[PDB]
Structure formats: C-alpha cells, structure tokens
From a paper:
We determined a 3.2-Å crystal structure of αNP-VHH1 in complex with influenza A virus NP. Anti-NP-VHH1 binds to the body domain at the end opposite the tail loop of each NP monomer, underlining that it does not interfere with oligomerization of NP. Despite being a potent inhibitor of vRNP nuclear import, the VHH binding site is distant from the known NLS1 and NLS2. Importantly, according to this model, αNP-VHH1 masks NLS2 of the adjacent NP protomer, providing a plausible explanation for the inhibition of vRNP nuclear import.
The major vRNP component, NP, is a basic, ~56-kDa protein consisting of a head and body domain and a tail loop (amino acids [aa] 402 to 428). Besides binding and condensing vRNA, the diverse functions of NP include nuclear import, export, and RNA synthesis.
Author numbering:
A (entry chain A), B (entry chain A), C (entry chain A): 21 to 480, 484 to 490
D (entry chain K), E (entry chain K), F (entry chain K): 2 to 123
The structure:
Amino acid sequence: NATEIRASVGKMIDGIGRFYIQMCTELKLSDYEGRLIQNSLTIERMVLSAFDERRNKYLEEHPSAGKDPKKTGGPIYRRVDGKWRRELILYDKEEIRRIWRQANNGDDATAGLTHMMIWHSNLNDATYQRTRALVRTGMDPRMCSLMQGSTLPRRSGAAGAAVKGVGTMVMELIRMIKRGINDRNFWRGENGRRTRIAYERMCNILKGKFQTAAQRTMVDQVRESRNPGNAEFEDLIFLARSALILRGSVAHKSCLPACVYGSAVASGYDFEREGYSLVGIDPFRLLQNSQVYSLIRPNENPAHKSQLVWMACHSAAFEDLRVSSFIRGTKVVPRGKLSTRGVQIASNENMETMESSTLELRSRYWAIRTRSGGNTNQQRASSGQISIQPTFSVQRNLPFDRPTIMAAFTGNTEGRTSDMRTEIIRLMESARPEDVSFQGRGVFELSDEKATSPIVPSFDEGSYFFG
Amino acid sequence: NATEIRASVGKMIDGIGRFYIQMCTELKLSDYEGRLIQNSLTIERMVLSAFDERRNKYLEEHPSAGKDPKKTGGPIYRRVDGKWRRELILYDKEEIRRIWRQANNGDDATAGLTHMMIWHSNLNDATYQRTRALVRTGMDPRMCSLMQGSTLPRRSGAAGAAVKGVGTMVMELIRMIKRGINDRNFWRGENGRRTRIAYERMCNILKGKFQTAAQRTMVDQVRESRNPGNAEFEDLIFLARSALILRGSVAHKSCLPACVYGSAVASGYDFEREGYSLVGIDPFRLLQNSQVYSLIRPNENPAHKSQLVWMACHSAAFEDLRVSSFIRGTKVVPRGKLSTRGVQIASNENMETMESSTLELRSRYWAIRTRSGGNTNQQRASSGQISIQPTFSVQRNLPFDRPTIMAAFTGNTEGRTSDMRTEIIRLMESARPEDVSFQGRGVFELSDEKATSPIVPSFDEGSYFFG
Amino acid sequence: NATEIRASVGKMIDGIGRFYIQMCTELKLSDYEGRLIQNSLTIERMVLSAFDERRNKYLEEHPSAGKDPKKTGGPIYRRVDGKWRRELILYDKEEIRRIWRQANNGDDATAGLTHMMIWHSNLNDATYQRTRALVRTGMDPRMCSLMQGSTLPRRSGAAGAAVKGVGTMVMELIRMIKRGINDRNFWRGENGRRTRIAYERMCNILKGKFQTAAQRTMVDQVRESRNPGNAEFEDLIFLARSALILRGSVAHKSCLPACVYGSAVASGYDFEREGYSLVGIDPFRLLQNSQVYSLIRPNENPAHKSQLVWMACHSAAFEDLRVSSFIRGTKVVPRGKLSTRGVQIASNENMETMESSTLELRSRYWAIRTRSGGNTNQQRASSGQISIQPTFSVQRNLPFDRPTIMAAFTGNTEGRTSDMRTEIIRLMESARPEDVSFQGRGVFELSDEKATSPIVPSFDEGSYFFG
Amino acid sequence: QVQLQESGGGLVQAGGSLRLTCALSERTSTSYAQGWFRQPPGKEREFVASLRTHDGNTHYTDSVKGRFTISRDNAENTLYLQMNSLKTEDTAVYYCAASLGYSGAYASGYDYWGQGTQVTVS
Amino acid sequence: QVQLQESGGGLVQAGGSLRLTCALSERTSTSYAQGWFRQPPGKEREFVASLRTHDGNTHYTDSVKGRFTISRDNAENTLYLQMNSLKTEDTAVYYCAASLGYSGAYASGYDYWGQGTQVTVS
Amino acid sequence: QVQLQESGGGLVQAGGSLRLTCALSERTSTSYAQGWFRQPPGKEREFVASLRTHDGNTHYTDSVKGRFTISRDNAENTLYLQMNSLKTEDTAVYYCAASLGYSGAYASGYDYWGQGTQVTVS
C-alpha cells in the first residue's frame, strides 16, 4: 500500500509549498524574485534556524556576538529597475515558527524541516568536497564518495540518517572516539551514560549501511569497546576505506528547493490527493515544468550553474558522470571544469555586476533513485580442511590450498578485528571495477509513468565528479 | 634398548586385556556381544569415569542431577534370539577401580587409562570435526587438521600431551587467555599463581610442537606476557594458522579398542614377553587377526563403518586419503560421502531396526606411524648488508636487495612479535603444496617385520577427509 | 662566505696538529714511531678520555677496578733496533688537558675533540659491523648501512649528531623506550623530565635525517607518545627498515688521524690561512703527501690494511665498492676477503712477530663527500575521488581505481601511524635498485681544485662491503 | 572349508522359471541371515534377496519384486531361491551369502560366500 | 508563439555594410537584455553583441569591435544591429536573443530566440 | 733518484747457477729488510726471497727452497741472490726490494724497487 505514504509525503510538500507562498507574501517579492533560488535558500535557512531548539537553547544562555538569539535572518536579493540590491533582513524565530505551523495545519511537522535539510545536504555535497574536515579528522580526501550528509546535523532523524553515507557516519563516530581520548568523557557522569547510547546508536546505523557480513561483524567488534582508543579509530577508518569497493546501502532522495514546491502549490497542485514520492518520477516531472532563476556572477557559465543545481536536486554529487549525462541528455561536466562557484553569493560581493539567469533543471530521461550500493556477491564460507597432518612415514607431498592459506595472512592485525580485516580485504580482491551492478535496470522516458520500458545504456570519458 | 619400553607397553596392553576379559565375565556377555565395539566403548568409558578423581571430587560436593556420583554407567547392547535389546547398567566407581587394579597386578597403572583415552581421541577426531568449538573459540573451521586431541582432557600426561596437535594446544591456551579477559583470574590469588604455571607449561608444549625457529621464538614472545590480552590471542591464532603449512611435530599412536586387546589376551598372547609398540607393525598385525563387530543402522554401509573404525585405529583422521587408500588397499572415502554416522548409538534410537556386522580392520600394507610434521627447510640467515649509504656525490644507482627488503615489510604488526610474523610468512612463502616430505620412506608388506623393503607409491583424487 | 668557516676548521686542524707534535715530543718518539697509526690512536684516545668529564665525574665517586680515575693511558708501540716493544704508559688526565689547551691557544676547543671522535667512528664502522648490538637491541644485522656513528657517544654535539645514521638514532632511541618498559624511568622524577627532553631532541634529529614527508610525519606520531611502549618500538624499527630504500640525509666528513695533521703542521702548513674543509678536496690532497705507517701481523696483507685505513678516512664504510674502487683506482675488496683484522693490536699479542708497513692512502680521483641520501622522488598527493556512490538504478559498472584503493590496505596497522606505514610502503614500491641518484655529479682529477670537469663512471662486481 | 554349496543353475529361456538351492553348513544353518547375490557379466556383485531367521521377514531388490521368492526348508538346512518370470536381465552368477548379524542389501555385511552357480536366460 | 522576428539579412560583398532588424514582441520589448548571436557554417552558435535596457551598456565580441554597433529604437520596439566593414568571417546566420536577467556572452543565459536571417558576405 | 741498482742477470741453461747482485743506496743499506721478487712472462710480480737485518733470518718461496740463498755482504752495502739448480720456471725479471718495516711475502710492504735484471734459463 503506497497511497498512504505517498499521501503523507504529498502533505509534507504541500506544507513547504503553502509556507513558501505565505513567506513570499510576507517579504512582498515579485514573481521573479520569488523564483530566485538564493532567496529560497535564505528563507529555508531562516526556518531551519528558527526551529533549531538545541541551538536556540545553547544561544540564549550563551549568546553569539553577532545578533540576539530570538531573531534569525539572512540576505534577501531584491531587484528594482535593472540593478540588483542585497538587503539583510531579520525576523523573530517565533514568528517564522508560527508561520510554519499555520502553513502545516498547526502541527510542528518536522518532516518538511528535515526535507529542506536534506536539500541543503545534496547542494552542499555537490558544491564542496570538505578536504579540510577529512584531513583534520584523519581520513583520506579521496573518500568524499562516502561523505554524503556531512553537513547534516546528527539531530536529523531516521529520515536524515538514511541519506548519510558510510564515511559521514565513520567521521561522526571518529569525533566521538577522538574526543574521549583527551579527557574522560566516557566517564560515569550522566554525559557518559547518554553518550554511550549515542555511540551505540550510530554504530548500529553504520552497521545498517553495510551489505556484507564481514563489514557488519567488524563494526560489531568495534562497538564492543567500552572505552574506544586508537585501535577503534583505525578500525572505523578501515571500514570507511572498505566502503569504496564493498559499498554500503545509502539512501538517495530527490529534494527540491522550496520555491519549486511553492510555485507548484501556487499553481493549484494538491500533493495529498495526487501523491508524491522522492524515489519516483514525480520530482523529475515537477522539474520539467519548473521555472527557477539563479543569480550569476559576471564571467560564470549559466549552463554550469544549471548543472550544479540539477545535481543538487537528485543527490548525484558522487554519481558516474557518464550515467548522469545520459539521464540529463547534456554533458555533466566535472567540478574541475565547472566555470562557476557556489550557488550562495558571498557577503562581500558587489551586486553592481551581479545578474541572474534561468536554470535548466530538465532531463532527457528519468531513473529511480536507489538505496542500494551495488552488487556485493561473495561468501565462499567453505568448512573443508585445507592442510594434511601426516600419520604414516611415507614419501609423498603434503598438500595444502596455498592460495587460501597464504591469503589468510595478508592484512593481519594484533586486535580482535584482525580476521574480519583479512576477510574484507579478501572480498575486496574479488571485486573489479568493471563489475556490473543493477542488472536489467535502465532509464525511462518522461512519458513512462510506471517504468514499463527500460533503456540500458552503452558507455564508451571520466566518471569522477572530483578531479 | 627397545626391549624395556616394548615390555612396558606390552604389560600395559595385557592389563587392558585381562581387564576386558574379567569385565566380559562380570556382565556375562556372549562371544559376539563381547566383540561388539559399542559395548567396548561403554566399558572403557566406565573405567575412565571411575578413575576420574577430579570429576568425582567435583561431583561429590556438587552432584549432577543425573545420578549419584559413586556410580558410573553406560548402555550395554545385548542380543537374545535375533532382537537387539539395549540395557542401561550402573556399577560403583570403586568396584571398577578395584577390578582395574586387580587386572594390573594391583597397581593404578594410569598408562592404560591414558591409552584408552587416546583411542577415544582418534575415534572422536575421525568422527566429528568440531566446527562449533572452533567458531566459538575464535578459530577457523578449516583448521581441524591441527585439532588432534581436542576431546582429550588436559589431565592426560605427557603421553596424552604428545598426541595433541598445534590447534588443540592453541585452543586450550585461548580458553585461558579469553577467561582472564573477563575477570582477574591471573590475580595474585593462589588460583592465579597455579594458573600461571599451567599456562607456561602449555606454552612450552606448544613450543615443543613446532620444528622451525621462528615459530618457537614467537611462542616465547607470547609467553612473556604476564597478563595476556587480545594481542596474545591473535598471536596464538597466527601460530595455529602457520601450523597448516609449517606443521608441527605431532605424535600418532595406534590405539585399539579394549575388545581387541582382550580377545588377544584371551587367546593366550603374552605381550610382556613378545613385546608391543604403537609405532611398530604390531597393531597392524593384531588387526589382521582381529574379529570385531559393530552395530549398524538400517541403511548404513558396513564398509564405511569399517573404514571409520579403521581410521580410528591409526589416527589417520587428517591423513592424505590417497596414502590411506594405499595402506588399506581399499578406497578410503571422505567424510562427506560416508554413508554412516557415529559408531556410538544414540540414546533415543530403537533397537528393533538395529543390526550388526563384521568390521574389516585389515590393511594391505603397513607403515610406521610418525611423530614428525614433514619437511620444513628454511634458514637463510644472511648477515650481509643490503642497502648502500652513499658518501661521495657521484652519478650512480644506489643498490638494494628489493625482494628481501620489500618482503620484510609484509605482515608487519605493532607488537613485540611483528618480526617473527614476517619471518613466518616469508617461510610459508617458500613452501609449496608439492613439496615432498619423508624422502625415501615407503610402506611395507605385512610379512615384513623389520621394514627391510619399502614401497614408495606414485599418486595420480581428493586428499582431504573433510569436504 | 666560505672563508670564515674554512678558517675555523683550519684552526681546529692546526690545534690537533701542534698538539700531536707536542705529544710526540713528550713521549720522545722517532720520526717512524710518530707516524705509526697505532700510537696515534693511543694518543687521541688519551685526549678524549681526559676531557671526558661525564666519565671522570662518574668514575671519581665510583672507581673502575682497573686504575685510578685521575690517570688515563694506553699502549705505545716503540721499536729499538729491529724488535717491536709495546709499553703501557700512564699520564694524568689534567696534564693531557693542559697540553691540549696550550696547543689550542688556551681554549677548550671541543671541536677538535669531536673531530677525533668522528675519526674513531669511521674507523670503527669500517672495522666492525656490530651484529651483537643489533640482535640485542631488536634490529636486523643486515641494517649496518644505517649504523654510522654507533660507537659515538650521545655527548657529541651537532657536529657528531650530523654524522650519525638513521639506524644509530633508531637504536639510541630504542634503548630509551626499552629502558622505560622495565621501570618508571619516565616518571615525574627530575630524571624523567630531563629524559623527556633528551627523547624529544633525538626524535627531532631523526626527523631531520629523513627527506620524505611520510617518514617525518610518522616520526612525529612516534614522538607524541608520553610513555612509549612496544608500539613505538616497532614503529622506530619500521622507520629504520624504511631507511634502506628511502634513505635519510646522513653527513659524511673525511676525518684523518692526528699523525697526518701533525706531520702537516710540522712541515709548516698553516691551515688558518690556507683553509680546510672536510667535504672539499683538501683531505684527499693531504692524503696524497701523507706518509703513515701501521703495524702489521705476520700473514696479513699490507694492501688490505691500507684499504681499511683508506675507507676509514672517507667514511666509505658502507659505500658502493664499485665507486670506491673508481675513486681509489685500486680494487676496494669487501670485508669478507680482507686478509686483515682490526688496525688496533690486541693486548695479548706478542710483538716478536709484529712488523709495520707503509699505508697507501692515495686515490686516483677525488669526489665531494655528500650529506644527502640520494634521490627520493614521490608525492602523488591526488585529492580526486576514486569510488562511485550510485544514485540511479541503472545497469552499469561502478568504477573505482583498484590499484590505489587496494594498495592503501597493505601494511595496515591498529595504531595511530597506520596510514603513514602504508604510504611509506607505497613509496618504497616505486623505488627500484637501478634508480640513479646524483644526476650529473662525477669524480674529479686531483689537479682539479674547483671541480670544473666531472667524470661520470660506467659500471659493469659486488657492491656491498659486508657479505 | 567352503561353507555354502549352491546348485540349481543352468540355461533357460525368457518367461520360464528356475529354483536355486544352497546347501548350508552347520555354522551357516544357524546364523542371523542368509541371502542371494548376483553378478551380471562385467558388472559388480549386486543384491538379490535376503532371508532372516528369528523372524521370517525378507528383503528383495526392485528388479525381482514379485518374480523372485527366497524361501527356506523346514527340517533341513537348505536355502531356496524361487525365480519366476525369468528375463534376460537375470543372467548372472548367483552367490549364496550368510551374515552373523546383517540382513541387508550391502554385500559387505555377509561373512561367508559360495562359488556361484550360472544362470543364463537366453 | 515565436517571440522575435528578425530581418535585414542578405548577400553583400567584403567591405560593405548591412543593418539587421529584430522585431520584438511585447514580452520581449520590456526585458532585461537583448543581443545578437551568429552561427557560422558548420560551427556552433557564437556571441556577437548584447544590449542592456535599464542602462545602455553593451558588450561586443573581439571580432566585431568597432565594426559592429548594436542599437535600439526609441518610440518603437525594434532592435538594430549595424554591421560595417563586413568581412567573409561575418558570414553566418544571425539570431536575436533576449534574456530576463542576463547580459552576457553565453548563449545559455538568453530565454527567447528567433529563427535566423542569413548574412552571406561573398 | 733510483735507490737500487741490480745486476748479474743474463742467459744460462737448466741445472746451472747464477748470482744476482743489488747495489744498495745509503738510505737502503740501513733498512729493516731487503728482498728479491721475480716477474715471469705475462704473470704478476711474485715473491722470491727476503733478508732481515737486525737478525739474519730469511724467508723463501716454496719453488726455490734449497736452491736459492739470499745473502748480504759484510763491509759493503751489496745484496746477493745465489741461484743454484736453475730451472725454466726461474725465467723472470728480478727486482730488488727493501722495506722500512716489513719482511714478508707481499710486494706491497716494500717501499723501494729496482728496474729488474733479466734471467732467461733456456
């Protein structure tokens, strides 16, 4: 029964929509300024900052030197005549709270909040690869493929925890193991008893990501440590590096900016009755009739801006550039050749040279967003003996399966997880780059609502979005 | 001078023999029922349970709910007319004690007890590969080749400790390291001071098993730990896995059921004067004129039963199936194709369908049972320098033995045993499955008492008894 | 400006020279006995023992059973008629102190003392490979290439610390880590606070030796340990073994015995005005007009003695035998074929068979002594992603750079330095024995004062001085 | 000291009948079971029939079910194998087996044997 | 509902001059900017000129600097492209573009287009 | 400034005898030892005899033991090499060596040399 959850998601999107319309009225924005994605980012950020009860509770008692805690704000980009003018606006957090509740039938409706947070995620992942956090946390800058949802707060519920990657969970746990190595934070203090439950929970999510037995059991051996040290540190890093080949199940949900949902609701679309699903065709559909602008710096390429926002809308930040180009019809260029910077406009840029342009968020085909991490297919699990212990003194060779035994000694370690390491390594030795996953799955035409006819593409350039 | 020890072993076997005759009189068994190997197992088990002073001392103060500690018992399989009837018998432990002493000139004569224990061992090793104990203890189920004497108690003296394998010693030490990781059992308590001597002793036996220097020195580095943890755990497991290629010296003694010795003594054979040796031809000889029956389930193959009992009598549970087939003349089939279960009959099986058959315990040839673990032949031990430290600024290549240096980095570890690991790995890299051991040693005809003419066989199926 | 330091070194050498002349007068040695290198070793040893304030301060309160602490001594080899006679002489330490000061304008002038210590070093390195210290300290006897300055005291300043090798620093730190594993020497006691500064200093010198980033950062991770254990032990050993391929910057200074400088000063050479440099041609020059004798045992080859002393004068103890043979013009034979023992004559040898011979310390060409350790040229440092996290469910292969990822798992470890180990291993995989270093650098004729025309040699036997 | 003499074999035609007789030694007359095996040309020895003594139950192979009937004589120590509806597949050499404790298909469980009697069914 | 009709193209000779005219729809008359692109034979569409409205600034490509001048009519909604010192390189198809917010070289920033008018300069 | 002039060489036949003389410079007359080396055709320079001064001991090679006798003159500074039972193996060039401290087989230990005198024993 998909109509129930489809109707719930639809009600969420309608909440965000009516909310964004009401907000566009509160500011009194033109039809163009309301479709500018920058102002949409400012609005969404204001809503997430207003409902940020942990941040507000930690900012009331200890205020940031910037501004009073009761008020949140952000730059709104307005255009009179032809000139762009950026104005800094401030609104009470309680006011934005009230407007959000009124737009969602009076409920808190945190689901839409987490939706906008995941949208912020996909945009941030598609915009910046955080090499600084990876080198400071002790990880490889070449592991950004696993860094989905790094900007997400741990406050995001199961909906936000599902979209995170293996590397994000590894990093988040590594901050906890590395924090407890300086002082006794795992101590018997109430902070320690609660932090142990946080740690075990995050270990369970990381265990849920992996789809091979060895990885899961290794995570189980990491969680057994009452006081994790450098050993569990290097263990979690080992798991993360294993997630490059033996990948984990990471959810991908197509989350759009609030101006798209708002323009759809303003046009009369009722998402409760019609239904909506992030993994279905609907987002693609909504993007084909979507009219969204974006501010553009002087020498930037508006097509590259459109590609950046497009990748942000389908979580394809770490996808194969070939298959993304096949979905969109136009070439999806890697980040190194993108003649653009972040969609966000800096606080020091002058609006005298700033312009705007239409965003080409359309795609030729469409495809089902997946939760899987591909085909991992290995479990020899032989229980047969492999060496001979001789009893009689007879001239013969003493047989043994040399490949298996000798392969059991590579990657050994003087810790409880040693075995698993070996197995993981062994499993990673069986996988090759050309191992095809998603057998039979293809792309579909936009007029194909029910995925009746797939299109399996044949590929000849580079596949990595980052260098 | 072999006549002394030959006469001692002969006196042991005569003790077991006269004892089994006296016992067959106490029960009043027919000549057929006394040659049934099941009843022999019941008798031997009763004797070992009676002289089990640690078990009886731990069962008098804390009784098992089953039966009173002063009495031991077991099922005796009797056959009237044509029907088999299984009766449960109970006898006082002191009575069996007295009968054993009377059969062995009034002495305790624990040597025969340990002999029957080793017979129970070879039968149990040939019948079950304990995958459960290997996975629970943290070992590989594919290491049963090293699991000789797993069922043996640690109470068995040097005679029983010699027949144990490397994997059995590793597992027995692993229970001790893993027990001390939960509580302070190595503490200053008298239990700890005694347990340290047990631990050092077992480490010395394990050191005696290995026949390569690196393995021995690594065991020495493991024993240095006053409080062993996970490091010594993974170390001992590493040694066990190394014992698959660089095998250790494990003794193999041909131990027969008490009904064979008893039927030989009843026929008038005097083993003190004639002599007996477990490694010599004598067991084979005694099996050629041995008439032994065994209960058989309906659909079982009596030939496979005969093969199971035959492998039990020569410790060839983990031998090359090719060479065992060459010794016996008939094909020794692996456990997977054995149309049989354990020789022991379960407590819930009905005797209405149970039958019996003769055991073909004869062999075409015979061979000397060995204590060695094959040819391990590596000690480069070069002391020459391998890198050049340049002094003059001249255009040249800076030579270094790349294979040796680069091979010294594989299998490294952050513990005291690191080096040895590497060396062991390196040594295991030199050995190949076709490396022939026991050069010049062959099999002999049964009419060849003094091993004058060997027969070196040439082999073409599978060699592993377990899968 | 090289004239300043050249003049300072010249003043040092003149100090040693005038001192050795004055000493040859104090003993009243003939022109032959003063040029015997053995007596020179005795003299230099007396001077170093006199100025040994830590040894004298530890020997006054606790005297060695041999002799009184105020007096140092050594064997002087005198020859009347034709017979050699060895006499044991004793002189006050304060007297030798006074004579040294008087020879160096009244100053302590420890620079010359450290010079003679480095000469003793190069001789000892060229004479003995200390396999005993390497096996007792836990190192490989095949690492003597890194053992420059093992006999040097840690008292030697930066001048002596620069000539030490990576293996010497590793061993010296290993004595400190291994000393603190028995008792609490790193404890809060003043000994511990001072010893921590010694440890950090030596770690910084070892860091200065390496010329690759990974090695340096690994040393940094070793120094972070407040209480080093077996982990830091195996780490330092790992660094030492890495110094065989990825070598470190080790200084090499041509230090001559005091009889050479003394004979040059006695001939009228003024080294302050003319200048002197250990890395320059001057030592070679001074050796071409040097007339030095050496005692020789009966069956010894005087040419091999000359080769030993020659290697001692240019630190070429661990050099390529090919290039040393090219510098000297005659074949530099490895230690195994040297028909000689140490230059030092034992205390139990009879002088009735002892003779002497001239030392051929000349060379065909000359070359600049270097501080570098060759060409280490690797820093890929790619920040590009290497795995694909799929979002759409489409039939395709999930690409990944298998060589890089799989190579990142070799040599892993459960400690903070794991990563670096891997990288070091990876770097060592790129280097090959035929990798040419010192591109364009060649040897020069003796009449070439300013290194105008180099001679790059072409090589066809063995290159290792030790086996 | 051969323990079982077997007779009655010969040459018949398809659809006919034959009766094989196995004289039993005194050791064999009082045994757990006695049966009949056949050896076809170029094939291993296969099971035919088996008769237990203390109770009268018998075991037959699938090829001869209904056609064959292994019987025993009362007041004499003689084994009988009644062979009706004879077929070319029955052409073999028939051995008489007896076991001290096994009544079963496998040849291995029987401890005494005869020397055959030919049955050729042309 | 094509939004821009362009005219004035044809056939001239090198060194001559031409004047392209672009009729502007009511949506297009009041827009952020409007420009001119050219498509040479077998080449991708390249930029020529761009005229902003609120201020009068213009952008030109390096090939036509000085020679071309993009102007606009007052009291009428018509765009003009003055083409002087015409060269063989100028042979292309000239499209009229207009953008709701972009005044720039890239073709992507303009949201409405015409159907060309040929300029062949033989 | 050559330090040793050697003479007495020439051409003899097998079984004959010869006497080589080495004039000694004043530096060489008072030295630790002086000896005789030979260079066969196409072979390296090999040892023949050695005479020490302070005591009179001598060293000989195995090929000339008994046949040769290295002597020294009293009241003159002249070295002598007495060569009896001459053989074809003795054909070589004979150099006069002297060492400030070495009395030994190796050529390396001697610090002054002559220019040879031929001995051909045909």
